[PDB]
Amino acid sequence: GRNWNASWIWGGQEESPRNEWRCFRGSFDAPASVEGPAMLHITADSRYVLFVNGEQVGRGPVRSWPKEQFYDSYDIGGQLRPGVRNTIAVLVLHFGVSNFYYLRGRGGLIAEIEADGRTLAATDAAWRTERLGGQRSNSPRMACQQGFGEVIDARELAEDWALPAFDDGGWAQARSIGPAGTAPWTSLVPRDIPFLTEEKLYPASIQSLSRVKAPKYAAALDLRNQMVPESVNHANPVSYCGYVATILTLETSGVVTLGFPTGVRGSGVWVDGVLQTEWTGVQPERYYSLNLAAGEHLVLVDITSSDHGGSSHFAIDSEAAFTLRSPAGDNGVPLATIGTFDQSEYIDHRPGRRMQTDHPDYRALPEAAPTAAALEAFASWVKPFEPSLYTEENVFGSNVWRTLAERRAVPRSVLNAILPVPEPGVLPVFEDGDCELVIDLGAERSGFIGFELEAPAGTIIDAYGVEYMREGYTQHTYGLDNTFRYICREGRQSYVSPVRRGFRYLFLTVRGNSAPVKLHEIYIRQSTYPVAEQGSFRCSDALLNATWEISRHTTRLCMEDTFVDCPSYEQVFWVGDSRNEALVNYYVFGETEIVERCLNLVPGSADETPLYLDQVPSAWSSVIPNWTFFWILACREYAAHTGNEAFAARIWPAVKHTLTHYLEHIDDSGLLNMAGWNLLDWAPIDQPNEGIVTHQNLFLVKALRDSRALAAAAGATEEADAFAARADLLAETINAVLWDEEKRAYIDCIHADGRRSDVYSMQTQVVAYLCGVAQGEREAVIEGYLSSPPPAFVQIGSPFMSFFYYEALEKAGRQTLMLDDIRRNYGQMLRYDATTCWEMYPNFAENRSNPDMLTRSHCHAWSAAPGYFLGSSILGVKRGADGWRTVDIAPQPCDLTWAEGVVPLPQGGHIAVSWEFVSAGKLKLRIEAPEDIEVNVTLPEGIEGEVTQVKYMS
C-alpha cells in the first residue's frame, strides 16, 4: 500500500445507513506548476463516483474483502487547473446491507491528491458533505446479490453540486472516522487491475410505443430485512414464518384484484379469514379476484419461506376506490407483518437448526382473526413495517402488471430519441395513460443508463431493462428489480444512473406529464474490463462464425473488475464460472491481470472456511466443492498460460491448504463424503447435499494431481507427492465402488443412508473421462457414450457442462461431433436472436422461475465455449509450453473448407493462422508468430499441403 495523509470521512449521525447516496466536496489551491504526475488515491464504502473540477473521472472501488480494501490511483493532470482553486467532488453510495460482492462496513470516503511527494489535498473535517438531494433511501433492494435500484426526485436535487462554482456554504462539515487502517478496512491495498471502460453507445431501434397504466397500488417490500432485522449483516439465506397484513377499505362495493408480480411466498392468501382458492397468472405471477362489498376487509398473505434477499412485490387494483392501513401502530406504511414465529439462517457447509412451521399462533391465526378486531388477540405478533424497507414507487411491479397495455405505431419523431442528432424525439401525450417506449439496444449490454430530456416538473421517468422478449412475450427479470425511477425538475436535464444494469431491451415509461416531453437522447454507457478484439476466428460455416461472435460478446460483458456470472441478475464473481471464462478470454481477448486478480481473491475466504467460498468477496458463506476444484484448475492454467512461476509460488500455499481440508472429508469408504451443496450441472443429476457424489469425487482426484503443476512451478514439487498418493487411492476406490457392471457406467452417487443411486447421467461419465479415472475398457465404454449419449441417461443441461463435454471430445479426437453439437445447441440460441450465450438449455426445470423459459440468464460467459474451442480445437492453435514459448499448430478442418483466426499471446504479439483446401485432401496453411516462438506443425490425418510460416520481430 502507501502511507496516507488523509482521513476516512462520512456525514450524518448513522454510521452505516441503508441505501444512502452521499455527496462530498473538497477544494484546494493547486501550485502554478507541478513536475511529476498529480495522483489522486481513493477508495470508499460502498462505492464511489469521482469528479475533478466538475468532470467525472472514474468509478470504484473494485470489489474487496474489507480486510484488504482496494483503492484507486488516478493521474488527474488532465483535469487539474494549475495556479488556481480546484474542486474535488465525490458521490458515495453506501449500501448498509451485505451482498454477494460487498461486506457491510460503514459509510466512508478517503481520498488524497499527491504530487512531487507533497499532499495537495486530503479528505478531512474541512470537507463538506450532504446526502444527494431527492435520493430515496427506501428504494427497492435490487437483488439478493446486489445493491439497490434507485428512485431520484430531481426537484430536490442540486444538479450542479459537483461543479467548481457550486455554493456549498450551507453544507455541513464532514466527520472524520480515523486515519488509514481504522476498522473495518484493516488495510488499504492498491487496485490490482487497470480501470474499466465507459463508452457511450446509442440504441439500435425503438421496438414499440404503448399507452399503458400501472396498478393503482404497487409496492416493493424487503421482507427479509423486515422479518429478520439482523439479516442485513450477511448474505446467507434466511427463513422466516409469518404474514403480511393490511386492512383494505372499499368506499363502495366492487371487484378488487390482488397482484403478486413475483408470486405468493407462503401457503396462500386470506381475506376476512377465508382462504382464497382461485387465482390466475403465469408462474411465478399470481392474481386474485375479489368480489367485495363496501367496508373494511383484513387481507392476510402468508410469506413463510426462505428468502435470500431482494424485493417482494404486492399490488392492488380496482375500478372502485379503496384505502389501506396497517393493523398495527401507524408509522406511514399501510402494511404490517405478523411474526416472526420462527426463523433460521442457512450456511450450506455447516449444520444448523432449521425453521419449523408449526407454531400454534401461526397455524390458527388466519381463520382465528377474520377481522382486525379479532386480530387484537394476536397483537403481540403484529408489528409495523420498517419505512426504509417499503416503497410504493415500484417500477418493476408497474411493468410486470400493467392494467392497460395498448400498442400504438411508433411516430418517426420518436426515433430521434435514440439517434445522435440535434432534433429531439417528441413523445405523444395520452389523455388517459402513460407513454411506454421499448428501446432495443440491438444486443445485450452492461452499464450505466443515461438520458437527456425536457419535461414539466414532476414528470416520472421509469426505466426497466430485460434481456429477452418475443412476439408479445416479455421475460421479466423476476428476482431482479432492474430499474430506477427519476422524477423530473422543470425544464431540460440529464441523468446517468450510477447503478450498473445488464439488459438488451429498455422499457422507458413516462408518466404524469401534462405537457409533451422532449427526449433528446436515451443511451447506455457500457462498462467492461478493458478488452480489445485482439483475438479472432472466422470460417466457411456462417453459423459457427455467429456462435463465436456471441461467445466473444458474452465474455466481454462478463468481465468487470472481476469475471462475473452474468451482467443482469447477479454481476457476481462466481469461482466455477471463471475457469471457463478465463480460457475463452485467453483466446478472444488475451487479458491476464483480471485472471490473477480473481484467483488471488479466493483465498481471502479462508477465514470463513478452508474449503473456500464459491463466490467472492461475498457475505454469502457458501461452498461448492467443484468450484474450488475449478479454482485450482484455473490457477494451474493461469500459471501455465503466463509461465508466471512467481505467482505459482505465491498461490501454492492456498492450494495446498484447501486440498488438505478436502481430504479430511474422505471417510472409511475412502470416498469424499460431504454434507453441503454438491453441485455440478443444472440437470436431474442425483447430486444430493447428502453424502458421496461421484462427479466431485472424480474432480478431487484431478485437482490433487493438477496441484503438482503449481507445486513444481513453485519450486516445491515434493510438497505435492502426498496428494498424488491420495489421488491414486481415491481413483481406485472410485472404480471399485462407484462403478456399475450391469450398466457399465459410474453411478451418480451414494446417498446418506448408503443407498446407491440408480440414476445415470452423461455428466458423471464425461467427468470420469476427463479426470482420467476411467481407463482401459471403462475408458472405451465412456467414449462410446460420448459419441452416442444414451437417451435414458440424464442429459447435459447447460452450455457450462457442454464445455467439459467438448474437452472430452477433443481428448477423444471427435472434433466433427463437437462442431455438430455446437451448431445444434448454440444454433438454437441464435434461432431466438440471442446476442450472448444462455446460462442454461431449454426444457430443464432447474434454476428458472418458469419451466417454459428458454433460460434464466441469457448472458453467462461460463457458456462461451465456442470462443475457446473454435480457435483451439478447429483452427488448430494450442499452447505448446508454459508462457507460449512454443506453439502447436494442428488444424482439424472437419467439414469446413477454410478457417482463419488470431490468438493473442500473454508476452505480447500473437499467433495468426489461416488455412483452406485448395484441392481434395490438400491444404494451404499460413502461420505468423514472433520469431522467438517455436512452432510445431501437424497437418490433419491424410492431408497434404503447403505451409507458409512467417516470423516477425518481438
CA 452 to each of CA 492, 763, 817: distance values in angstroms, whole numbers, following the listed order: 7, 51, 51
- The single-letter DSSP state of residue 422 is S
CA count, 13 A, side-chain hemisphere, 224: 24
Helix (H, G, I), strand (E, B) or coil at 869: helix
Output the CA torsion sign for 633, 635, 638, 640.
Answer: negative
CA–CA gap between residue 398 and residue 378 (Å, rounded): 33
Residue 923: partners with Cβ closer than 8 Å, 6 or more residues away: 891, 893, 915, 916, 917, 939, 940, 943, 944, 945, 946
Of 811 and 951, nearer to Ca ion (C-beta) is 951
- Report, in Å, the least distance between residue 417 CB and Ca ion: 8
CA–CA gap between residue 441 and residue 420 (Å, rounded): 14
- Stretch 54-93: interaction string toward Ca ion, x if CB under 5 A: ----------------------------------------
Q: Which of residues 923-952 bind Ca ion (CB under 5 A)?
A: 951
- Report, in Å, the least distance between residue 424 CB and Ca ion: 6
Is 297 a known ligand-binding residue?
no
For 80, counting Cβ atoms within 10 Å of its Cβ (0-12 exposed, 13-18 middle, 19+ buried), the class is buried
Of 481 and 521, nearer to Ca ion (C-beta) is 521
CA–CA gap between residue 555 and residue 861 (Å, rounded): 5
- Report, in Å, the least distance between residue 201 CB and Ca ion: 14
Where do the DSSP E strands lie in 198-325? 199-201, 205-213, 217-221, 238-240, 243-250, 254-260, 269-271, 274-275, 286-292, 295-302, 305-307, 312-318, 322-325
Of 363 and 951, nearer to Ca ion (C-beta) is 951
Of 455 and 766, nearer to Ca ion (C-beta) is 455
Is 67 a known ligand-binding residue?
no
CA–CA gap between residue 796 and residue 808 (Å, rounded): 13
- Report, in Å, the least distance between residue 420 CB and Ca ion: 7
Short-list 817, 744, 218, 149, CA closest to 483: 149
Angle between helices 593-601 and 575-588 (to 10 degrees): 170
- Report, in Å, the least distance between residue 123 CB and Ca ion: 37
- Report, in Å, the least distance between residue 518 CB and Ca ion: 9
Of 348 and 521, nearer to Ca ion (C-beta) is 521
Short-list 423, 462, 453, CA closest to 516: 453
Of 472 and 908, nearer to Ca ion (C-beta) is 908
Nearest residue to the partner Ca ion, using Cβ: 520
CA–CA gap between residue 593 and residue 380 (Å, rounded): 56
Q: Which of residues 367-406 bind Ca ion (CB under 5 A)?
A: none
End-to-end distance of the chain based on CA atoms, in angstroms? Answer: 33
- Report, in Å, the least distance between residue 412 CB and Ca ion: 15
Of 307 and 521, nearer to Ca ion (C-beta) is 521
Of 749 and 933, nearer to Ca ion (C-beta) is 933
Of 732 and 931, nearer to Ca ion (C-beta) is 931
Of 488 and 818, nearer to Ca ion (C-beta) is 488
- Report, in Å, the least distance between residue 421 CB and Ca ion: 6
Pairing state of beta strands 483-487 and 151-153?
Answer: parallel
- Report, in Å, the least distance between residue 422 CB and Ca ion: 6
- Report, in Å, the least distance between residue 521 CB and Ca ion: 5
Cβ neighbour number for residue 353 with a 10 Å cutoff:
9
- Stretch 525-564: interaction string toward Ca ion, x if CB under 5 A: ----------------------------------------
The site that binds Ca ion (CB under 5 A) totals a number of residues, namely 3
Of 206 and 382, nearer to Ca ion (C-beta) is 206
Site membership for Ca ion, residue 454 (CB under 5 A):
no
- Report, in Å, the least distance between residue 212 CB and Ca ion: 25
Contact yes or no for 196/527 (Cβ under 8 A): yes
* One-letter amino acid of 911: I
- Report, in Å, the least distance between residue 35 CB and Ca ion: 42
Contact yes or no for 528/557 (Cβ under 8 A): yes
Angle between helices 815-831 and 799-811 (to 10 degrees): 160
Residue 150: partners with Cβ closer than 8 Å, 6 or more residues away: 21, 135, 136, 139, 484, 485, 497, 499
CA–CA gap between residue 822 and residue 838 (Å, rounded): 13
Of 521 and 719, nearer to Ca ion (C-beta) is 521
- Stretch 680-699: interaction string toward Ca ion, x if CB under 5 A: --------------------
Short-list 410, 414, 438, 409, CA closest to 427: 414
CA 768 to each of CA 434, 699, 731, 744, 862: distance values in angstroms, whole numbers, following the listed order: 58, 8, 10, 13, 21
CA 937 to each of CA 536, 946, 947: distance values in angstroms, whole numbers, following the listed order: 20, 11, 9
Of 436 and 521, nearer to Ca ion (C-beta) is 521
Is 759 a known ligand-binding residue?
no
- Report, in Å, the least distance between residue 206 CB and Ca ion: 14
* One-letter amino acid of 700: L
Q: Which of residues 490-529 bind Ca ion (CB under 5 A)?
A: 520-521
β-pair partners for 99 = 102
Binding residues: 421, 520, 951
Annotated binding site for Ca(2+): 421, 520, 951
Binding site for Ca ion (CB under 5 A): 520-521, 951
